[PDB]
Write a protein that binds this ligand. Structure first.
Ligand SMILES: *[C@@H]1O[C@H](CO)[C@@H](O)[C@H](O)[C@H]1NC(C)=O
Ligand SMILES: *[C@@H]1O[C@H](CO)[C@@H](O)[C@H](O)[C@H]1NC(C)=O
Ligand SMILES: *[C@@H]1O[C@H](CO)[C@@H](O)[C@H](O)[C@H]1NC(C)=O
Ligand SMILES: *[C@@H]1O[C@H](CO)[C@@H](O)[C@H](O)[C@H]1NC(C)=O
Ligand SMILES: *[C@@H]1O[C@H](CO)[C@@H](O)[C@H](O)[C@H]1NC(C)=O
Ligand SMILES: *[C@@H]1O[C@H](CO)[C@@H](O)[C@H](O)[C@H]1NC(C)=O
Ligand SMILES: *[C@@H]1O[C@H](CO)[C@@H](O)[C@H](O)[C@H]1NC(C)=O
Ligand SMILES: *[C@@H]1O[C@H](CO)[C@@H](O)[C@H](O)[C@H]1NC(C)=O
Ligand SMILES: [Ca+2]
Ligand SMILES: [Ca+2]
Ligand SMILES: [Ca+2]
Ligand SMILES: [Ca+2]
Lengths: 609, 696, 105, 180
């Protein structure tokens, strides 16, 4: 091993970590080569140091540095989904992906699963991909019985909605804006990059090409058939509206699309053209925001229409990145007569002749007080790029006169059990129950949830189909209202699986539901409402899981339903503890009969507060 | 604001203006298009007098051909339906082949009998020409020639619109010969109530005249009348009066696909087994054509019951009750939807190649800082901590890889286990003979010669000795982890969390915040795509790593997305000490992800990355590990459940010895109290008397 | 792509230029526009595309057929950078379809 | 405002700063290029200790090879002299094979004996690296490795700047013996 060159203590950032594994008094740590108290060490963000008691803002949330950690607010900010190019989308969760397509697709909808939908937004590339025009996307908004189409740079309310008092159409800079309610809005770039903004009241209710609005990027690409696809093309094809229209062709990652596809040299000239996104004007935004997705989009949408100038494909990607930067508060002065210029002089060529009121701004405030909009609005964006009228103090813009003007111008049952319980319902989604029978099992669960004091205090409930995996529709920590929880329990779907592993659902409750006991005061009980055998080879760990549940003091109540319940597993559960009382039933029809003694047995096996 | 033309039956044509004539074609002829300037051309293709195809040409840049047998050709290449390109949409509607171009302002169709029709938007009123006429209020100023004259002769008109090509140059066609109890069938148009409804809108006299002509031309029975009745009914429908009875007030039934039935006023936005519902926001007028029976649904062009509808996943169809699985979760097909499990599955953190990473939450990233870094730790109960030592692994500054791994196990009396370069292991600084089983800890040689480590069921690790580390955690650790592999909470979006409790948007500042030592340099920027520093390498790096996206991995491309592995491969090959080894490592990394999703790829070949075994052993793409070693004979009651895996194995009758040589069962040594005995050894003692046979 | 460059260069045959297309032949400049738009594909704005049109507009202006061919979308030129001066945003600069050459300065 | 590098005789190299050493190369090595960001790479190609070609890579989009026998190859296609592409010009000057790129800010030559020389504009002062050294007033600091450390040894320096390709995986060179 020839060598050309040759040659625990803790510091504010490392103190929480392991020792190096390869110097100050106790209760003390180094900063700037000096030992200092831990309560004086700075917090780190952006790689920058901030002293204790300094405060930083991250989106809508803000955090104060407390004892070397960020003591944040817990708000959910207004989530933005965006079309960011000709063929690129960013979900409400920030997952950028590629999906070209000639058809019409659901960008977002509220009509998801069981949820009664308030709106849809539809998008498609109809009329693109040919020489005679630069490409434009259609938009179609279907809020509360209305219909608004956005196309060819124009807004068209083709059908009035059932209550217009919540609806506004706005323009600011080069961007159209629509407000469709207190919690829904759209911002439209006339050059392809359509954007949608939702407040925290929607979240998991929405679905589509925008994904489903939650914390979880990994559960976007959920198809309309509710299965997550590994390929964005198959996901996007599932959101195709028109049943007969052509599915987007799947293809390998060729080095670039279209005009670049043969032309590696000119592809590198596209890459250098996109290096505007990494220039010194953007580099301050490039701390807060990753330029890489927008650069990749710029490659795709400049290999579409190879340019260093305002084709609809190219400059759009940088205007979109600048817009996102401005929403992060990093305004970018990126346009020049050398690159992607805009001219507002046509707005100053007024009926009196040429007169300055308009000019381009890197971002103007949106939804301003206007003769067309006499009062402020719940605007979805802080500011937007484009032409703006720099009116003198107190004057109001009139858009139709294109000019500044004076403001003078223009309980359910008698049994309602109230005691310290955690309860889980484990439902045999095998084929051994038909859907018609499984509806009775669901009704049994729901009606027991009418007879228990459902809350985080008193009785917590989880509801779990297993069906040869495990499928919690409700978990113990779900803080939703009791009528919402009963609604969800009634909306439990039916698998009808060829197998239903009793052992693996016991494994799931043992390790994943009761991962740690957070309510030592409560009893905890599992109704194993089992209707199918396991195939013998799967069952081998069953006794280990039920005895582990006994060690975790979970009572297991095996409710054997019908002739195909394997009585062996029923009695093997009873053999672990007297508390594990079985019930055995000839059909689901007597679940609703035995319900009284079952629910009362639960309450007998749970202590009072 | 539209007009319609058709070419139908034997030889007949109906203009946009309702003038009718007969023409047996032999060329291909302009039906319609922009007359003064030609934005598109719609062409009727004929052979031996019969129609054979409808072809649309867009400017001169694109052309698409739709045959009466449902074949479609673009340029000279056959293409499958449905299809969409250059703003045209070519599809089935109401069981009939449709070709829409309403961006250009037209739509066209071929029915099951081979009748053409074309519809033009009012955009082309008085601005079109061809066999379908000139689209204006007059019907008698049709027959305009390309010479711009009228003519009284339909064959002078139609031949004037003939278009020759390099495929064939075509003769002037002429009328066929003629020599003319069915005649009453044509008089249905005049006599019979359903047809008689439409007399205020469509005059029957031309259609009954054409009907009598087809009765003269046609050799069949009463069915010889039907094209004129069908085209009259379609003309009435275009004039806004549907003839709901016409096909059973007469013997005439149009052709339809198997299991479909002909009916009038089929809706657009036809429902299918795979399609979400538009809740009547279709906003388009109905058409005639084939439908499935009521309550039955269409799927990929065949009718099936609503209870029979397949689910789709991975581009394939599956019947109801089919179970698929992703990792530990299963998805069961019911109705149009998948009932998908919601349990958490084992988290596979990875470090591989030139310091590429995968989080427990599947976030791929590259960092390439040089230090000791906290890879993965139980931040709640501190039951384990895994640390990696990263070093520069070539002359390049971007070539950085893991040299060694350190595992601290506080529950194992705070033991420290180091996994060394070259797949050695030390425990508390002392080098150990690798099969180790003390306490909850177990360490073992994988058939790959990789070190495998286990610590109860809830932690496992697999270290190749060449800078690849795979870490598996059970769901018991979900949400509890910290370090470069993130918090294992199922979400990518927070994996760049740092000890300060904020997520750094920069992978550099994220990774820097997990460095264990203060004199280590902070990585200022991570230079993605290092091929710029060795341009000689880029051509090979592209050409070689493109195998990951080639057909050989196609079975895996829908089980694991290849794109992060392709980025990792091109980085590895462009910036490492031997790009051949780095190529094989990247391809093996993707193939291992495939095998983790249960897809096995035969990716090795004599041109790349053969896993050449020592003498006496044989390569297997999948062999069972549990019965390979002589130790397996010596401890035949031991638990072993490990899956079939790639490696070098002894031939089927032989076990593997300490020398790596392959030996028959009778020649294996025996292992007792951790001490090794040869075949036929005896020992006898005051406690026991024992002998070695068959490796036991 | 050949028909993209061709149709993109149809600006030279549009009704704003058709008055010049009497006195001057568009075809040579259109051929240059084909060649240059092959080097930059932009339908709305790129230097090679915009300059070959601007060259034709210059020839037209020399024939007295002054032409207002640019727009806020088609090859925009923006003078607003010159307006920002020591008075702030002051109205003096504008794009002119043709400025008289060599004015007293 | 220019500096010159040379590779001459049997094995010898002269840096931009006038340090000289012997190096029997067996692969291809970075002579000069943009060090913090690589706008171009100028590459010396060797076989059996001898020089055989002087090559330039422009980003990764174009590569040109000039052999000591006057053959020129672009990518893998042979091209006749004189030649001009991508802002490079490749021509005879004073009977010797000249490759110019003063848009990028360099020029290079092979003479009739096969000696290379490379010239950088002041644009690359203290901003270049490779066998030609770091191009600054100091000369003792020319042996800067790609690993970022100043070695005392010219073969450690030169091997540190070796660049492999799919055709040519670089073996490490070491000093040959002599009877002297
Ligand atoms: C934030 O600080 C307050 C005050 O010390 C404390 O009550 C709260 O638990 C802290 N929360 C977090 C997340 O640090
Ligand atoms: C307009 O642009 C200037 C910079 O030129 C900026 O300071 C200002 O905030 C922008 N907005 C308004 C409303 O002036
Ligand atoms: C359809 O007909 C055309 C000729 O009219 C022929 O070339 C093609 O092969 C046919 N396709 C099928 C599937 O028979
Ligand atoms: C149709 O166009 C011709 C010119 O080609 C014109 O003379 C005639 O009046 C037009 N007819 C109608 C109804 O517009
Ligand atoms: C190991 O088991 C497999 C079956 O799982 C068998 O085919 C193989 O022969 C066994 N190996 C030996 C050495 O017996
Ligand atoms: C300047 O522009 C105007 C139109 O904006 C034009 O009429 C005029 O002739 C041009 N020249 C001068 C000197 O005003
Ligand atoms: C010049 O040298 C190279 C390398 O030895 C060789 O490939 C090429 O064929 C030679 N050309 C001639 C004309 O000898
Ligand atoms: C050369 O560059 C280094 C930075 O890499 C700098 O520290 C040094 O001062 C520079 N020397 C000269 C002479 O410019
Ligand atoms: Ca989501
Ligand atoms: Ca007419
Ligand atoms: Ca996470
Ligand atoms: Ca020097």
């Amino acid at each position: 091993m020839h060598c050309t060159m040759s040659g625990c203590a803790k510091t504010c950032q490392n103190y929480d970590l392991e020792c190096m594994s390869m110097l100050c008094p106790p209760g003390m740590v180094r900063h700037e080569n000096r030992c200092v108290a831990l309560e004086r060490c700075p917090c780190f963000h952006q790689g920058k140091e901030y002293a204790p008691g300094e405060t930083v803002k991250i989106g809508c949330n803000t955090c104060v540095c407390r004892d070397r950690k960020w003591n944040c607010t817990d708000h959910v900010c207004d989530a933005t989904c965006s079309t960011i190019g000709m063929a690129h989308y960013l979900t409400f969760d920030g997952l950028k992906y590629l999906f070209p397509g000639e058809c019409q697709y659901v960008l977002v909808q509220d009509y998801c699963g069981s949820n009664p939908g308030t709106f849809r937004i539809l998008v498609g590339n109809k009329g693109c991909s040919h020489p005679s025009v630069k490409c434009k996307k259609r938009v179609t908004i279907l809020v509360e019985g209305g219909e608004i189409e956005l196309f060819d740079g124009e807004v068209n309310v083709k059908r009035p909605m059932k209550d217009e008092t919540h609806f506004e159409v706005v323009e600011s800079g080069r961007y159209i804006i629509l407000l469709l309610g207190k919690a829904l809005s759209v911002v439209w770039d006339r050059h392809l990059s359509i954007s949608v903004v939702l407040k925290q009241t929607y979240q998991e209710k929405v679905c589509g090409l925008c994904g489903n609005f939650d914390g979880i990027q990994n559960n976007d690409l959920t198809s309309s058939n509710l299965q997550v696809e590994e390929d964005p093309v198959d996901f996007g094809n599932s959101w195709k509206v028109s049943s007969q229209c052509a599915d987007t062709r799947k293809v390998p990652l060729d080095s670039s699309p279209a005009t670049c596809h043969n032309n590696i040299m000119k592809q590198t000239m596209v890459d250098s053209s996109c290096r505007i996104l990494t220039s010194d004007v953007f580099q301050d935004c490039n701390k807060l925001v990753d330029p890489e997705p927008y650069l990749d989009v710029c490659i795709y949408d400049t290999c579409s229409c190879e340019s260093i100038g305002d084709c609809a494909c190219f400059c759009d990607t940088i205007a979109a990145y600048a817009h996102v930067c401005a929403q992060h508060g990093k305004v970018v002065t990126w346009r020049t007569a050398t690159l992607c210029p805009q001219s507002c002089e046509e707005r100053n060529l007024r009926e009196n002749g040429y007169e300055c009121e308009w000019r381009y701004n890197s971002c103007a405030p949106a939804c301003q007080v206007t003769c067309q909009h006499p009062e402020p609005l719940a605007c979805p964006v802080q500011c937007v790029e484009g032409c703006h009228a720099h009116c003198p103090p107190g004057k109001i813009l009139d858009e139709l006169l294109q000019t500044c003007v004076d403001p003078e111008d223009c309980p359910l049952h008698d049994f309602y059990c109230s005691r310290l319980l955690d309860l889980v319902f484990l439902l045999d989604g095998s084929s051994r129950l038909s859907e018609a029978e499984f509806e009775v099992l669901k009704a049994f669960v729901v009606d027991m949830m009418e007879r228990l004091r459902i809350s985080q205090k008193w009785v917590r409930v989880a509801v779990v189909e297993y069906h040869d995996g495990s499928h919690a529709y409700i978990g113990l920590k779900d803080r939703k209202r009791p009528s919402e929880l009963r609604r969800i329990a009634s909306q439990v779907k039916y698998a009808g699986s060829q197998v239903a592993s009793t052992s693996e659902v016991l494994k799931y409750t043992l390790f994943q539901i009761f991962s740690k006991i957070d309510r030592p005061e409560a009893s905890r009980i599992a109704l194993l409402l089992m209707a199918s055998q396991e195939p013998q080879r799967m069952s081998r760990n069953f006794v280990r899981y039920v005895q582990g549940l006994k060690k975790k003091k979970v009572i297991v109540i095996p409710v054997g339903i019908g002739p195909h319940a394997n009585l062996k597993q029923i009695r093997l559960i009873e053999k672990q503890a007297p508390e594990n009382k079985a019930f055995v039933l000839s059909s689901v029809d007597e679940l609703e009969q035995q319900r009284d003694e079952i629910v009362s047995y639960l309450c007998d096996l749970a202590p009072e507060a | 604001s539209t007009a319609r033309c058709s070419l139908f039956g034997s030889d007949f044509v109906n203009t946009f203006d309702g003038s009718m004539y007969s023409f047996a074609g032999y060329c291909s002829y302009l039906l319609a298009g922009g007359c003064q300037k030609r934005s598109f051309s719609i062409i009727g293709d004929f052979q031996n007098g019969k129609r054979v195809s409808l072809s649309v040409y867009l400017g001169e840049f694109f052309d698409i051909h739709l045959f009466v047998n449902g074949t479609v050709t673009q340029g000279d290449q056959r293409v499958s339906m449905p299809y969409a390109s250059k703003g045209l949409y070519l599809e089935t509607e109401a069981g009939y082949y449709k070709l829409s171009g309403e961006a250009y302002g037209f739509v066209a169709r071929i029915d099951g009998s081979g009748n053409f029709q074309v519809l033009l938007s009012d955009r082309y009123f008085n601005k079109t020409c061809g066999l379908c006429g000139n689209f204006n209020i007059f019907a008698e100023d049709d027959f305009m020639t390309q010479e711009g004259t009228l003519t009284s002769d339909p064959y002078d008109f139609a031949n004037s619109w003939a278009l020759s090509s390099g495929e064939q140059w075509c003769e002037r066609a002429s009328p066929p010969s003629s020599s003319c109890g069915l005649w009453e069938q044509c008089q249905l148009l005049k006599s019979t109530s359903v047809f008689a409804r439409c007399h205020p809108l469509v005059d029957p006299e031309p259609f009954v005249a054409l009907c009598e002509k087809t009765l003269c031309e046609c050799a069949g029975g009463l069915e010889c009348a039907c094209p004129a009745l069908l085209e009259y009914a379609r003309t009435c429908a275009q004039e806004g009066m549907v003839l709901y009875g016409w096909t059973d007030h007469s013997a005439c039934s149009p052709v339809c696909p198997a299991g479909m039935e002909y009916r009038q006023c089929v809706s657009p936005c036809a429902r299918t087994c795979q399609s979400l519902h538009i809740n009547e926001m279709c906003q388009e007028r109905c058409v005639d054509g084939c439908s499935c029976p009521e309550g039955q649904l269409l799927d990929e062009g065949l009718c099936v019951e609503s209870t029979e509808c397949p689910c789709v996943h991975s581009g394939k169809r599956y019947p109801p009750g089919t179970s698929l699985s992703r990792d530990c979760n299963t998805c069961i097909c019911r109705n149009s939807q998948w009932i998908c499990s919601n349990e958490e599955c084992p988290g596979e953190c990875l470090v591989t190649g030139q310091s590429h990473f995968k989080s427990f939450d599947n976030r791929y990233f590259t960092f390439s800082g040089i230090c000791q870094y906290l890879l993965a730790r139980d931040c709640q109960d501190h039951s384990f901590s895994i640390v990696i030592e990263t070093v520069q692994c070539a002359d390049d500054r971007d070539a950085v890889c893991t040299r060694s791994v350190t595992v601290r196990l506080p529950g194992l009396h705070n033991s420290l286990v180091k996994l060394k370069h070259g797949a050695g292991v030390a425990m508390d600084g002392q080098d150990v003979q690798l099969p180790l089983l003390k306490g909850d800890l177990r360490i073992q040689h994988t058939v790959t010669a990789s070190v495998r480590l286990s610590y109860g069921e809830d932690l496992q690790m697999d270290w190749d000795g060449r800078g690849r580390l795979l870490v598996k955690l059970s769901p018991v650790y979900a949400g509890k982890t910290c370090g470069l592999c993130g918090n294992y909470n199922g979400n990518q979006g927070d994996d760049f969390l740092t000890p300060s409790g904020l997520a750094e948007p920069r992978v550099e500042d994220f990774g820097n915040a997990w460095k264990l030592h203060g004199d280590c340099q902070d990585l200022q920027k991570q230079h993605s795509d290092p091929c710029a520093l060795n341009p000689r390498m880029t051509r090979f790096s592209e050409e070689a790593c493109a195998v990951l996206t080639s057909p050989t991995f196609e079975a895996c491309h829908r089980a694991v997305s290849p794109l992060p592995y392709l980025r990792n491969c091109r980085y590895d090959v462009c910036s490492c000490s031997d790009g051949r080894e780095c190529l094989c490592g990247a391809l093996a990394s993707y193939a291992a992800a495939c095998a983790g999703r249960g897809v096995r790829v035969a990716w090795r070949e004599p041109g790349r990355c053969e896993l050449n075994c020592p003498k006496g052993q044989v390569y297997l793409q999948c062999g069972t590990p549990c019965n390979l070693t002589c130790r397996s004979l010596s401890y035949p009651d031991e638990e072993c459940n490990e899956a079939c895996l790639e490696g070098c194995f002894c031939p089927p009758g032989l076990y593997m010895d300490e020398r790596g040589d392959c030996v028959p069962k009778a020649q294996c040594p025996c292992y007792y109290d951790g001490e090794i005995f040869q075949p036929e050894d005896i020992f006898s003692d005051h406690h026991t008397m024992c002998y070695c046979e068959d490796g036991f």
